[PDB]
Design a protein around this ligand. Structure first.
Ligand SMILES: [Mg+2]
Length: 235
């Protein structure tokens, strides 16, 4: 369920650092509500301030497939402003014994600023060339906009495919030496690059995308894995 890599891309991947994908929970991968219409995916029972509370949790469409794929490309880290008792239980259910969401950071690791919880990425990994955050609240990565992938907030829309639409970009991004080469772009000029090093990172980024676009001109077997990838990645 992952497109085959070219010999060039595979060699490039060995020449660059391993990368971390920081993942938010609420309105990014799940949406939940407590007591006070579709059946929830799971129900958490957590006691907070010694009062028992029920949370009905809905998974964003395709989150399990999404996590299965990106866990092959990045080290996944949960960074949430929720209380550990809640965030930890959600992560346990999301991980579902796959052992990909074992590293978590909760409210006690966020900085509060102008009513927003800031998730200081350097808490997770201070080499900012090799860390990325996927979060629906831009306030959460206010201190690291160059390392952020924004995503629409999700609450219930069953037709949402945003997690699927992120997969080829997240695939291509892991071939850069510095993720900021790509994420820092996203006023009058037409320059996407400001250095030869950034330009080389965009060449690598685009090379992987090229493998997506032209995968159908490959031999039988590679072409069959391509058709599978395109039919699965909502393209
Ligand atoms: Mg959120």
């Amino acid at each position: 369920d992952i497109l085959p890599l070219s010999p060039v891309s595979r060699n490039r991947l060995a020449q660059v650092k391993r990368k971390i994908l920081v993942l938010d929970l609420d309105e990014t991968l799940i949406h939940s509500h407590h007591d006070g219409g579709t059946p929830p995916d799971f129900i958490l029972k957590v006691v907070i301030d010694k009062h028992p509370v029920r949370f009905f949790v809905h998974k964003r469409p395709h989150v399990d497939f999404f996590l299965e794929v990106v866990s092959q490309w990045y080290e996944l880290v949960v960074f949430t402003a929720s209380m550990e008792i809640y965030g930890s239980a959600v992560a346990d259910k999301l991980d579902n014994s796959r052992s990909i969401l074992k590293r978590r950071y909760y409210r006690q690791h966020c900085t509060l600023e102008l009513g927003s919880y800031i998730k200081d990425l350097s808490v997770v990994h201070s080499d900012l060339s090799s860390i990325v955050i996927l979060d629906n609240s831009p306030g959460a990565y206010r201190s690291h906009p160059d390392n952020a992938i924004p995503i629409k907030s999700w609450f219930s829309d069953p037709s949402d495919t945003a997690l699927l639409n992120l997969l080829p970009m997240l695939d291509a991004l892991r071939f850069t030496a510095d993720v900021r080469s790509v994420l820092s772009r996203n006023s009058a000029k037409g320059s996407e690059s400001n250095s030869l090093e950034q330009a080389e990172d965009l060449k690598a980024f685009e090379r992987r995308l090229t493998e997506y676009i032209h995968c159908l001109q490959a031999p039988s077997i590679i072409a069959a894995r391509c058709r599978t990838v395109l039919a699965e990645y909502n393209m």
